[PDB]
Amino acid sequence: GSSGSSGLAELFEKAAAHLQGLIQVASREQLLYLYARYKQVKVGNCNTPKPSFFDFEGKQKWEAWKALGDSSPSQAMQEYIAVVKKLDPGWNPQIPEKKGKEASGPSSG
């Protein structure tokens, strides 16, 4: 009926795996957009020295991740996910079905 109240992180985990599959649909900038936030949720405050001027490739990275001074992790996962949804509308992370077998359960060693 209404929006879902499922966990946030859980998604950030799945989406991440999709990224590698949405690389062809993700533009150069799109790749970073996820990196920066992905770094703010894993590490947090840049707390890192600015890259060299000549080193552009690395520059952008530090920048995008730098802009996230003291940004929250969840707030970074929200945008990090949605995006992937725009690139691939045929993505269903929240699936009720159950397909998986795990022997590791009863007495073992």
Short mmCIF file of all heavy atoms in Angstrom, two decimals, residues 2 8 13 15 19 28 34 40 63:
data_model
loop_
_atom_site.label_atom_id
_atom_site.label_comp_id
_atom_site.label_asym_id
_atom_site.label_seq_id
_atom_site.Cartn_x
_atom_site.Cartn_y
_atom_site.Cartn_z
N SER A 2 1.65 1.43 1.04
CA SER A 2 2.51 2.60 1.16
C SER A 2 3.98 2.21 1.11
O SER A 2 4.31 1.03 1.07
CB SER A 2 2.21 3.35 2.47
OG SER A 2 2.26 2.47 3.58
N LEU A 8 17.98 0.14 5.50
CA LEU A 8 18.65 0.96 4.49
C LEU A 8 19.96 0.31 4.06
O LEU A 8 20.17 0.05 2.87
CB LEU A 8 18.92 2.36 5.04
CG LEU A 8 18.98 3.48 4.01
CD1 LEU A 8 20.05 3.20 2.98
CD2 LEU A 8 17.62 3.67 3.34
N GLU A 13 24.21 -2.69 0.34
CA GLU A 13 25.04 -3.87 0.09
C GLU A 13 24.72 -4.48 -1.27
O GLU A 13 25.63 -4.75 -2.06
CB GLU A 13 24.81 -4.91 1.19
CG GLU A 13 25.21 -4.43 2.58
CD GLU A 13 26.67 -4.71 2.89
OE1 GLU A 13 27.49 -4.72 1.95
OE2 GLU A 13 26.99 -4.92 4.08
N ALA A 15 22.90 -3.12 -3.95
CA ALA A 15 23.19 -2.15 -5.00
C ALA A 15 24.66 -2.19 -5.38
O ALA A 15 25.00 -2.29 -6.56
CB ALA A 15 22.79 -0.75 -4.56
N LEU A 19 26.36 -2.30 -9.09
CA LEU A 19 27.21 -1.28 -9.70
C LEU A 19 28.08 -1.88 -10.80
O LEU A 19 28.08 -1.40 -11.93
CB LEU A 19 28.09 -0.62 -8.64
CG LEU A 19 28.46 0.84 -8.89
CD1 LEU A 19 29.28 1.39 -7.73
CD2 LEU A 19 29.23 0.97 -10.20
N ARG A 28 30.88 8.13 -16.53
CA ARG A 28 32.07 8.43 -15.73
C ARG A 28 31.69 9.12 -14.43
O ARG A 28 32.08 8.68 -13.35
CB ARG A 28 33.03 9.32 -16.53
CG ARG A 28 33.50 8.69 -17.83
CD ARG A 28 34.75 7.86 -17.63
NE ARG A 28 35.36 7.46 -18.90
CZ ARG A 28 34.88 6.50 -19.67
NH1 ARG A 28 33.79 5.84 -19.31
NH2 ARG A 28 35.48 6.20 -20.82
N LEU A 34 28.83 7.61 -6.86
CA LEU A 34 28.65 6.50 -5.94
C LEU A 34 29.88 6.30 -5.06
O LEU A 34 29.78 5.92 -3.90
CB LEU A 34 28.36 5.21 -6.72
CG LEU A 34 27.25 5.30 -7.77
CD1 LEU A 34 26.92 3.93 -8.32
CD2 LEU A 34 26.01 5.95 -7.18
N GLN A 40 32.06 7.97 2.19
CA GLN A 40 31.57 8.70 3.35
C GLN A 40 30.81 7.78 4.30
O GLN A 40 30.70 8.05 5.49
CB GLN A 40 30.67 9.85 2.92
CG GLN A 40 29.66 10.27 3.98
CD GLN A 40 30.32 10.88 5.20
OE1 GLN A 40 30.17 10.38 6.31
NE2 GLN A 40 31.05 11.97 4.99
N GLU A 63 37.58 15.29 -4.28
CA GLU A 63 36.60 16.37 -4.28
C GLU A 63 35.21 15.86 -3.90
O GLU A 63 34.67 16.21 -2.85
CB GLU A 63 36.54 17.05 -5.65
CG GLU A 63 37.71 17.99 -5.91
CD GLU A 63 37.36 19.09 -6.90
OE1 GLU A 63 36.51 19.94 -6.56
OE2 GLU A 63 37.93 19.09 -8.01
#
